[PDB]
Write the structure tokens for this entry.
Amino acid sequence: GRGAKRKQQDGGTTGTTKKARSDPLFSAQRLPPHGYPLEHPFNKDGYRYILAEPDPHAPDPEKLELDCWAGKPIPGDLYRACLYERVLLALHDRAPQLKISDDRLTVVGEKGYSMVRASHGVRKGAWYFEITVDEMPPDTAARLGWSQPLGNLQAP
DNA sequence: TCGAGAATCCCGGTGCCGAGGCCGCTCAATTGGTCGTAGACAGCTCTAGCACCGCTTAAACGCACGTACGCGCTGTCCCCCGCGTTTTAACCGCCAAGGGGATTACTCCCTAGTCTCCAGGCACGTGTCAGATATATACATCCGAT
């Protein structure tokens, strides 16, 4: 009856394993260390993992004690890790090697190549915006421009 | 080859007394001469470790072998320990004291040092016997016979 936790820890057989790998310097995210609005950019380019907008699930996996998420999930009212009005870049489709401020204004890269994408599309209207390059040390490429989510977040 | 339970590591999260650094106030470490001297240089004397060889034999060399036991294996059985319990004084922190350990001051007396002469203990002969050396023997022991 205690094998369910081991199955959940090893990885199970539900597709991708339950053992995250984001080994570059990942910061500016994953603030609340509990079951709340969270995010995990993954090593594998193209993995977006988020917990905001929660959901219940079916209880009683292996006739253990009744889980609290049976029909009445626990509530949550705290920090949510995203932005609505105009996403300053993003917090979901990113690489786990980018350092951003708490207010999400500055972007600091890794020892190697890195990028940040956004989460807002443009179809009509004026979007005359700016990227103020605070500083650029030698051997630090600073190419900027629009791209697509299909783009590999670590590819040049 | 795989779980349940059981432990340890670490992330906070917080409160506290020990290493630290500054100020103030000493006491012994230099500096410079000064004075006596211990050892360094060169010479000469003597004596023995070394190179050398001769001849003799006690002992090392190496084979032969027959068995004593070191070792692997078995079985055995018994008691050390881990788990649990009840049981209790080491440890903590608090009191109070008197006594004696460390410090001050002092007078006094034991001793380093000098000078003094004489006597006894090591270098050096010299006579002499205690025990090693080789011979013959009663005896206790390993081995072999029953």
